[PDB]
C-alpha cells in the first residue's frame, strides 16, 4: 500500500528539512501504514512538533480521526489510518574510539575499542553474585539518544553505560 | 464544537483595497485542520473559490483573481486574514470563511459577511 | 483546472419523487493511490451558507439522511435524492478538491417541488 501524511518538523533548521508539507511513504506488502502527530497543549495554546509516516502500530488500528488519548502528559501524541488523516487534531483522553575492560576479552588485557560506549552490570545468580563488563559498537546503540542497553530495572541488575576510557570496572 | 466567526467591514469605496478577519472558536487553528479557505458568492450568482492557505504560511491564490489578493494566517490570535486590491462593482459579494480539508472537501463554513463596493 | 459543468440549471420534480443531478468535470478526479474521486456536494437554503452533503463522491456525511447518494467516475457524477421532500429544496453545488491546486465549483443547480 502507499500513504500520504501530512509531514510537520519543528527542529527543521538544525535537521535542515522542510518546516511542513505533504510526504509519501512507500510501505511494506505485507504490513499498513499510518499517519502521526504530536504537539504541546500548555494550557489552550497549542505549538506543533511532529507531524508525518508512522509505521505499523497496533495502536493505530481502525482509526480515522487523529485524537490523544493519554491522560494529561506533558506531550500529547496521536496517530490515524488512511490518507491525510494527521490533517486534524484534537485532545480526548480515554475511559479505559574510547577503550575500556570486556570481562571476556582476556587475549588483550581484558579490553576492546568500540566506536560506541562499554557496559558494566550484574545480580545475585548461580547462589552468590557475578560481574559482567563489556564494550558495544555504535551502530548496535539503539534508540541514538537512549540506548536500552544502558538500561535496567531497579528490582535487581543494574546498568551503567559510559564513554570515557576504562570507566565499566566495579560497583 | 468548532465554529467559523468572520467579520468584515461591510462597505467598501470603489477601487480600493478591501480587509477581511475571521475569528475561531471551539478549535484551535493550528489544530484541527490544515488548510483554510475563503470563498466569495456574488450577489445571486454561485460559488468562487478565493484562496486557501496552510497554518504554515504558505497560501494558494486562485489563479482567476491572483496578483490582486493577500491572504495570511496569525497562529499567536487564532485568526486569518484575507485582503483584496483595485475593487470593483463585481466584487460585491458574500464572502465565506471556511476550512479546506484533503479528506472531506470543504466540512465547516462560517455565516458569511456581506461586503458592497459602492461609492 | 478541472472546469465543472453542472445540469440542468433548474429542476420541478413532485413530492416523493425522485430527482437527480449531474455534473461533469473537463479533467479525471480519480486519485491512482488509492482508488478515490475527490468530489464534493454542497446543500445551500436561502440566507445560509452551503452546507457539505457528500464527499469522495459517494461517501455520506454524518447526520445526512439516506435519501442523498452520490455515485458516478471519472469525468462523470451523480446525485440523487430518493423521495424529494420540501425541506431538500435548495440549490445544490458540485465541487472538486483533488490535491491539485484550483479548486473550483460548479454553476448551480436549484431543485424545485412540484405542488
Known amino acids: 500500500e502507499t500513504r500520504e501524511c501530512i509531514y510537520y518538523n519543528a527542529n527543521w533548521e538544525l535537521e535542515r528539512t522542510n518546516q511542513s508539507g505533504l510526504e509519501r511513504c512507500e510501505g511494506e506488502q505485507d504490513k499498513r501504514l499510518h499517519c502521526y502527530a504530536s504537539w504541546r497543549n500548555s494550557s489552550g495554546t497549542i505549538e506543533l512538533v511532529k507531524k508525518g509516516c508512522w509505521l505499523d502500530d497496533f495502536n493505530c488500528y481502525d482509526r480515522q480521526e487523529c485524537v490523544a488519548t493519554e491522560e494529561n502528559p506533558q506531550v500529547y501524541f496521536c496517530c490515524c489510518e488512511g490518507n491525510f488523516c494527521n490533517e486534524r487534531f484534537t485532545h480526548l483522553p480515554e475511559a479505559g574510539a574510547l577503550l575500556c575492560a570486556c570481562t571476556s576479552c582476556l587475549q588483550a588485557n581484558y579490553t576492546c575499542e568500540t566506536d560506541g560506549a562499554c557496559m558494566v552490570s550484574i545480580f545475585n545468580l548461580d547462589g552468590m553474585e557475578h560481574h559482567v563488563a563489556t564494550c558495544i559498537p555504535k551502530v548496535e546503540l539503539v534508540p541514538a539518544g537512549k540506548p536500552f542497553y544502558c538500561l535496567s530495572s531497579e528490582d535487581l541488575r543494574n546498568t551503567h553505560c559510559c564513554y570515557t576510557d576504562y570507566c565499566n570496572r566495579i560497583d | 464544537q468548532l465554529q467559523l466567526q468572520e467579520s468584515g467591514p461591510g462597505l467598501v469605496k470603489p477601487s480600493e483595497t478591501l480587509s477581511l478577519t475571521c475569528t475561531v472558536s471551539g478549535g484551535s487553528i493550528s489544530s484541527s485542520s490544515y488548510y483554510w479557505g475563503w470563498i466569495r458568492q456574488p450577489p445571486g450568482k454561485g460559488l468562487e473559490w478565493i484562496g486557501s492557505?496552510?497554518?504554515?504560511?504558505?497560501?494558494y491564490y486562485n489563479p482567476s483573481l491572483k496578483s490582486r489578493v493577500t491572504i495570511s494566517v496569525d497562529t499567536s490570535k487564532n485568526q486569518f486574514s484575507l485582503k483584496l486590491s483595485s475593487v470593483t462593482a463585481a466584487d460585491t459579494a458574500v464572502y465565506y470563511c471556511?476550512?479546506?480539508?484533503?479528506?472531506?472537501?470543504?466540512?465547516?463554513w462560517g455565516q458569511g459577511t456581506t461586503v458592497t463596493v459602492s461609492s | 483546472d478541472i472546469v465543472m459543468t453542472q445540469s440542468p440549471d433548474s429542476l420541478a420534480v413532485s413530492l416523493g419523487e425522485r430527482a437527480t443531478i449531474n455534473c461533469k468535470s473537463s479533467?479525471?478526479?480519480?486519485?491512482?493511490?488509492?482508488?478515490?474521486?475527490?468530489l464534493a456536494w454542497y446543500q445551500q437554503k436561502p440566507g445560509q451558507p452551503p452546507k457539505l452533503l457528500i464527499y469522495?463522491?459517494?461517501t455520506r456525511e454524518s447526520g445526512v439522511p439516506d435519501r442523498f447518494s452520490g455515485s458516478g467516475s471519472g469525468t462523470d457524477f451523480t446525485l440523487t435524492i430518493s423521495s424529494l421532500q420540501a425541506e431538500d429544496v435548495a440549490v445544490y453545488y458540485c465541487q472538486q478538491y483533488a490535491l491539485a491546486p484550483p479548486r473550483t465549483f460548479g454553476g448551480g443547480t436549484k431543485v424545485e417541488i412540484k405542488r
Open positions: 469522495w463522491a459517494s
Open positions: 471556511a476550512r479546506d480539508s484533503l479528506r472531506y472537501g470543504m466540512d465547516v
Open positions: 492557505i496552510s497554518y504554515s504560511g504558505s497560501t
Open positions: 479533467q479525471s478526479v480519480l486519485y491512482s493511490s488509492n482508488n478515490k474521486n475527490y
